[PDB]
Amino acid sequence: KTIKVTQTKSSSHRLKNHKLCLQGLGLRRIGHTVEVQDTPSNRGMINKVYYMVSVEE
Amino acid sequence: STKNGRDSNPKMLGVKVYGGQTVTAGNIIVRQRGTEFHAGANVGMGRDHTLFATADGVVKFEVKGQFGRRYVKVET
RNA sequence: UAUAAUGGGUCAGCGACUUAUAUUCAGUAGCGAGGUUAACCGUAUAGGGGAGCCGUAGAGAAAUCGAGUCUUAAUAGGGCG
RNA sequence: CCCCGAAAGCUAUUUAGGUAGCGCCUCGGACGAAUACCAUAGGGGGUAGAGCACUGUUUCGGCACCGAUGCAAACUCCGAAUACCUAUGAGUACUAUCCGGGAGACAGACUGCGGGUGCUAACGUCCGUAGUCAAGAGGAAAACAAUCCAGACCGCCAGCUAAGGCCCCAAAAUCAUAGUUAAGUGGGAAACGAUGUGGGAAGGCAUAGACAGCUAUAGUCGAGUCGGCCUGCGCGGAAGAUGUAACGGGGCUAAAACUAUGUGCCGAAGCUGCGGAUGUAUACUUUGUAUACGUGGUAGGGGAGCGUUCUGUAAGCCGAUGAAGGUGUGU
RNA sequence: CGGAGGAGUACGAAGGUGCGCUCAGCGUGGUCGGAAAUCACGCGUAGAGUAUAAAGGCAAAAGCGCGCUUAACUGCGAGACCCACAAGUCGAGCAGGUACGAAAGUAGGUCUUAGUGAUCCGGUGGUUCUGUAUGGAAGGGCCAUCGCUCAACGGAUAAAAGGUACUCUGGGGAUAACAGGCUGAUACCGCCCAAGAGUUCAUAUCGACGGCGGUGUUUGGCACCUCGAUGUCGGCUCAUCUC
RNA sequence: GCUGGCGACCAUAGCAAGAGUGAACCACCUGAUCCCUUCCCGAACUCAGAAGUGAAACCUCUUAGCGCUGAUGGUAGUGUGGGAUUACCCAUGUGAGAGUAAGUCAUCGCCAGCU
Secondary structure, three states: OEEEEEEOOOOOOOOHHHHHHHHHHOOOOOOOEEEEEOOHHHHHHHHHOHHHEEEEO | OOOOOOOOOOOOOEEOOOOOOEEOOOOEEEEOOOOOOEEOOOEEEOOOOOEEEOOOEEEEEEEEOOOOEEEEEEEO
């Protein structure tokens, strides 16, 4: 139902839509962890920034 | 010296309203130099081959006829 | 720009967004469909002085009309209100 | 002192280092979900690639056609990924939009990707696109705006990490396992040349005796031998002017080099811990208390203050039991 | 100051409408008449044409004829495209008058995209506007229209070429000449393959056609440093390094 | 079950080759008085009709002969992140064109007339 997403790298130099995906997931800094619903809409944002997040199911 | 160096101003042609969008009578749908698209139901043709809506509805693109022409129409 | 680009040998003193008028916007105070006097008079920051100005109606080049008016053969349509 | 924060573009200009409108910044007001990210659904294309059906161009055959075979920014029978437009939807976010006050700017630079130009030259020049600098400190790269990691409110002799590293200069493994190199290769370079050394696949001949040498195919001799292919790491090709000067240095060879795998650790102004300040919002239905999110900054915009001279308050208050000024100390 | 071409027009029909028609090429035959004129029949075929450059188009052909005609109208115009402004573009539909069709209908120039010039100042035709005491008039306004190779084409004036080594000021390393820097086309040096030359014999010595590098001397490219100054071609004196 | 008219669809549907049909319909056909027609022509268009024919044409059937359709798998390209710079490699997502196997001698709607 819900998964935990942790930000592992900086977002300062990433693409605009990638920063917007992090913001739309709710992550704010390196090491921040959020708990979000497991829906395809959220998973799209997660998969777009797969390279700087870590997911715990 | 060179004998080249000229060009004309842009003309901004192209599709203005895509399939599935809602239009109001008079809205321009396609700007085109020739008849790349042809006018279907509820679509009119201007003197410079512009395609425009003559009724309120939803735009639809299709291919029909013996010549395989591209048509655009407005469904009410 | 460490730059081998400019300026300064050092100290003390002086040295550069002002003033008048008009106008627009914001804040604040008085009065409020009204607000306000100018020159001037005045044992004079008072009190007088309503000429004038701004607001309260617009349309049209204008004559003209006026919550309408212009365009037009049109009461249609349309533009400014 | 606090908050926000650009641009070096488009269009026009006796214009090109000026200026104006628009784009980009800031402040006030109005209005709230109308906005964005992502997921589904609908849509057009003529690029990358490819192809020869048109237009050109090309080679070899056969009798302009026919058959095999190539090429194209201004060719197309075809044709993506992305990007762009629209609708619906979850979650997250002070998002979009409109009306006004004030601007600055209109010399850009480098790097990656797609290109024109140039010699597939230039730290060259002109566009598109993204990042950084500009206007941005910290750590790595010897030193090094534009590369990598990362965005500095203040304090701490606390902890964890990123890039990058762990023999000494100099913080952390002279750590573990298995191989390769002998060139200080590592720590600059090509066509080409060569029994350098690892690994792999296949082939030829051979104890009715193979290769080399030896004796004039026979003959002693008693195991492997011969020639290519693929691939890892090395060698030569390799000449310059102040002084080793092409690992930063010392030094390094079962490495302190290279390849693969695994345990730890060091490492930033990043993250966490403790203390303090400040801005915005939400609630307390006064507050000055809690929670959440912020506080790098040039040109600029906005907000809040400290001191100096003079006027009133002031015929007041302080002053020869010592004012202003000067010079130390403490707070 | 990249690669290639066009425009500064034309047409009262080459516009509107109703009706009608398909090109080009080739092969056969047929007087002059053939490569190619015109006639007849067939085969596969848009390869023709579209006033003009190219592109996008063109069977209800947008290509080609005939008859009648003036919609190459007047007042407008929902709604859009494009856009700094000024401008530019498409447009269903309403009213009046009209043309061609039996009619449903079609027509607000031409298949489209170039064929162009703001404002000021004046000229001409209209006009129920204005008219400096009053009635007129002059002049002005409104509607339609005329005069620019203002081509440096958003057009500074109605009206304008040169010299300065006799020179001067404000600026720029935003921008040239010297030297430095980046680069190495060019320059110089080296190597690979080897037809051939050398009485025979590529390699004693040379070495065609081609290929790969090095250096930073030359001629150059760029414009990064210096224009609030880095101030010289050669000679003299004195040198120091590379191979 | 055949014939005609009007559509849907626009090659798996078309082209080519062979074959078949005259009861009705259709087509060829007879004539040029009147309507109407030829930049000349009753060829076309038009009118008045039934002596002939299914020849031509149109329709229907058969054939994979040309054409058209066309997988699976692989290759090229490509968004994001990383590594390299003749421009490729890795992770992940996506994925042609050509060619190969193979398929195709269409499929439907309304009206009217015959047997």
